[PDB]
Amino acid sequence: GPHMATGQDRVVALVDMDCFFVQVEQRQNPHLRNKPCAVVQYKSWKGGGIIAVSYEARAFGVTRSMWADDAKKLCPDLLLAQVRESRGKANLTKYREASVEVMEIMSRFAVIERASIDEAYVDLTSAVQERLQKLQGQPISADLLPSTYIEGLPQGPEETVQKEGMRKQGLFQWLDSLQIDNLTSPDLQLTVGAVIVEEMRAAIERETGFQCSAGISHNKVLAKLACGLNKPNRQTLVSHGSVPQLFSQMPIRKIRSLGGKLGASVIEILGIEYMGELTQFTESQLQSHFGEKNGSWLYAMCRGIEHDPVKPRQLPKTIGCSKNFPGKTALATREQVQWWLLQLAQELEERLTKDRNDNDRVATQLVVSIRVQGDKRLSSLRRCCALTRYDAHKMSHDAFTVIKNCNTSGIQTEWSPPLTMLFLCATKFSAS
DNA sequence: ATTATGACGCT
DNA sequence: AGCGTCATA
């Protein structure tokens, strides 16, 4: 009734750089632009592994986690860019620097939460308010929303044949209905957020050349969900009112954080398939199956409601260095293990120093992770030690000190079982 | 031999 | 503290 919270208190956006790694390589090498292309790392094993794919290439069925040799069978003209290799490993510096280009432009408009290298959440609530005062009850022209889609529209009543045609029909339906008289109507607020998102995205492309997609809604999960509805280079407005129809045929695994084991349990235990079917279960029922927190979250989420805040954080919380040693390449000697801990430590030191100079902070804890031959777990062991100095040899030495007793070998010089993964992460930052 | 990252929850 | 889940660069 009148006391039922509807979760329309915020305007939040999710922005995702389209095939980011690919765009970065294409900006630098015009020959790759507007072509089927992919970024790959390494080359020897089956042409190297693919980690990003242009949309031209996706139409051919090329995906990430695919071997380049195999992608070439689906798409013979596919162009490839290799990740830079340093110290015998993949180095992602070019893309991290590129990401900062984007994050710093986004920050001019609103407060952002860096989710990963290529996507961030935006809290547009206060921004929308300010804009709504300048508008002075003035209607919003469709011309201000040239790449916006309104989910669920158009509906009801011959140009409806092409994609752009449909987009505009929906947009006009949405705008014709808007009641601009009310400055507290959630739909008006979402709409103004979309205007701002258009502007943010224009600013990003003009100043970097990078294109992106975006979702606009009242919370992070709906925003994220919306972002993926119309790609590439488009944005989607998912209103609170669109939720029931949209969720009625939305597989549970499409909602963020339900794409794994918990989503599978939800589907198996409850005997449902779509997000909307969740509304038939009381909060208590949900809690009894999935715990108090997930239960409460699910109850609200299937109703389009979520309260997780956009955290004011533009910098990553950790800085890590990682390398897998698969199959026959696994590390089985001591000199081998130390040499790689040293290569990793040397990258880490280089990245931490620049981070201390750029961002006025120092990491204080070193996490060391390894994997042993046979364990299906990403990580077999995790030990942390103190990180007092940015010195590669010290960090590499301390890392060894905390793992050296994992060696089963009776011989000092050999290492068993062979290690299939080394990982050094700097964490626990402090002001400096 | 589905990388090399990143964020977060549980106990 | 050390382990596990979820997500795509």
Q: Provide, in whole angstroms, the distance separating residue A40's CA from nucleotide B3's C1'.
A: 10
Q: Is the CB of A64 under 7 A from strand B?
A: yes
Q: What is the largest CA-CA distance in chain A?
A: 80
In whole angstroms, give the CA distance from residue A236 to residue A8.
Answer: 17
The β-bridge partners of A215 are A14, A236
b/e string for A238-277 if b means 16 or more Cβ within 10 A?
bbbbbbeebbeebebeebbebeeeebeebbeebeeeebbb
In whole angstroms, give the CA distance from residue A192 to residue A200.
Answer: 12
The dihedral over CA atoms of A291, A295, A297, A303, expressed in degrees to the nearest 10, equals: 170
In whole angstroms, give the CA distance from residue A220 to residue A10.
Answer: 10
In whole angstroms, give the CA distance from residue A284 to residue A288.
Answer: 6
Resolution (Å units)? 2.2
Q: Could you count the other beta carbons within 10 Å of the beta carbon of residue A68?
A: 21
Q: What does the H/E/C string look like for chain A?
A: CCCCCCCCCCCEEEEEECCHHHHHHHHHCHHHCCCCEEEEECCCCCCCEEEEECHHHHCCCCCCCCEHHHHHHHCCCCEEEECCEECCEECCHHHHHHHHHHHHHHHHHCEEEECCCCEEEEECHHHHHHHHHHCCCCCCCHHHCCCEEECCCCCCCCCCCCHHHHHHHHHHHHHHHCCCCCCCCHHHHHHHHHHHHHHHHHHHHHHHCCCEEEEEECCHHHHHHHHCCCCCCCEEECCHHHHHHHHHCCEHHHCCCCCCHHHHHHHHHHCCCEHHHHHHCCHHHHHHHHCHHHHHHHHHHCCCCCCCCCCCECCCCCEEEEEECCHHHCEEEHHHHHHHHHHHHHHHHHHHHHHHHHHCEECCEEEEEEEECCCCCCCCEEEEEECCCCCHHHHHHHHHHHHHHHCCCCCCCEEEEEEEEEEEEEECCEEC
Residues 6+ apart with CB under 8 A from A326: A420
**Residue among A306, A316, A368 at smallest CA distance from A337:** A368
- Cα end-to-end distance, chain A, whole Å: 52
Q: Is the CB of A329 under 7 A from strand B?
A: yes
Cβ A213 vs Cβ A230: under 8 Å:
yes
In whole angstroms, give the CA distance from residue A333 to residue A417.
Answer: 10
Q: Could you count the other beta carbons within 10 Å of the beta carbon of residue A107?
A: 14
In whole angstroms, give the CA distance from residue A110 to residue A272.
Answer: 38
Q: Is A119 annotated as a binding residue?
A: yes
Q: Could you count the other beta carbons within 10 Å of the beta carbon of residue A423?
A: 19
The dihedral over CA atoms of A332, A334, A335, A338, expressed in degrees to the nearest 10, equals: 110
Q: Provide, in whole angstroms, the distance separating residue A95's CA from nucleotide C3's C1'.
A: 30
Helix A93-109 / helix A186-208 crossing angle, nearest 10 deg: 140
Q: Is A114 annotated as a binding residue?
A: no
The β-bridge partners of A213 are A16
The β-bridge partners of A121 are A14, A113
Length of chain A: 432
- In the numeric block, which tokens belong to residue A237? 């407005």
Taking CA A310 as the corner, what is the angle to CA A305 and CA A311, rounded to the nearest 5 degrees? 140
Q: Is the CB of A173 under 7 A from strand B?
A: no
Distances (CA, A) of A120 to A62, A104, A117, A234: 25, 11, 8, 16
Q: Could you count the other beta carbons within 10 Å of the beta carbon of residue A393?
A: 13
| Domain residue limits, chain A | 1-18+89-251, 19-88, 252-309, 310-432
**Closest nucleotide to the alpha carbon of A65, via C1':** B2
**Closest nucleotide to the alpha carbon of A378, via C1':** C4
CATH 3.30.1490.100 assigned to A310-432: yes
In whole angstroms, give the CA distance from residue A114 to residue A120.
Answer: 4
**Closest nucleotide to the alpha carbon of A90, via C1':** B4
Distances (CA, A) of A32 to A66, A90, A257: 20, 21, 34
**Residue among A221, A180, A216 at smallest CA distance from A201:** A216
In whole angstroms, give the CA distance from residue A204 to residue A233.
Answer: 12
CATH of region A252-309? 1.10.150.20
Q: Is A275 annotated as a binding residue?
A: no
CB < 7 A contacts with chain C (nucleic strand): A 17, 19-21, 51-52, 64, 90, 92, 116-118, 256-263, 377-379, 381-384
Cis-peptide, bond into residue A186, ω within 30° of zero: no
Provide the pairing of β-strand A111-114 with A89-90. Answer: unpaired
Q: Is the CB of A96 under 7 A from strand B?
A: yes
Q: Could you count the other beta carbons within 10 Å of the beta carbon of residue A397?
A: 14
Q: Is the CB of A316 under 7 A from strand B?
A: yes
Distances (CA, A) of A342 to A42, A100, A119, A365, A413: 20, 27, 31, 17, 17
Residue type, A301: M
Residues 6+ apart with CB under 8 A from A217: A11, A12, A190, A223, A225, A226, A237, A238, A239, A240
Residue A68's Cβ-side half-sphere holds a number of Cα atoms within 13 Å equal to 22
From the candidate CATH numbers 3.40.1170.60, 3.40.50.150, 1.10.3720.10, 3.40.50.1820, the one assigned to the domain spanning A19-88: 3.40.1170.60
CATH class of A1-18+89-251: alpha beta
Residue with tokens 């918990």: A262
Long-range contacts of A130-138 (CB under 8 A, 24+ apart): A131/A192, A131/A195, A131/A196, A132/A183, A132/A188, A132/A189, A132/A192, A135/A180, A135/A192, A137/A180, A137/A181, A138/A180
Backbone CA torsion sign across A22, A26, A32, A34: positive
Q: What nucleotides of chain B have any atom within 7 angstroms of a protein Cβ?
A: 1-10
In whole angstroms, give the CA distance from residue A249 to residue A269.
Answer: 19
Q: What nucleotides of chain C have any atom within 7 angstroms of a protein Cβ?
A: 1-9
In whole angstroms, give the CA distance from residue A26 to residue A277.
Answer: 43
In whole angstroms, give the CA distance from residue A275 to residue A158.
Answer: 34
**Closest nucleotide to the alpha carbon of A369, via C1':** C2
**Residue among A198, A190, A180 at smallest CA distance from A138:** A180
**Closest nucleotide to the alpha carbon of A42, via C1':** B3
Residue with tokens 């607020």: A189
Q: Is A17 annotated as a binding residue?
A: yes
Q: Is the CB of A47 under 7 A from strand B?
A: no
Distances (CA, A) of A411 to A339, A407, A414, A415, A416: 18, 9, 6, 8, 9
**Exposed (0-12), middle (13-18) or buried (19+): which is A374, by Cβ within 10 Å?**
exposed
Residue with tokens 């015009």: A30
**Residue among A251, A407, A290, A310 at smallest CA distance from A107:** A310
Q: Could you count the other beta carbons within 10 Å of the beta carbon of residue A161?
A: 7
Helix A125-134 / helix A186-208 crossing angle, nearest 10 deg: 100
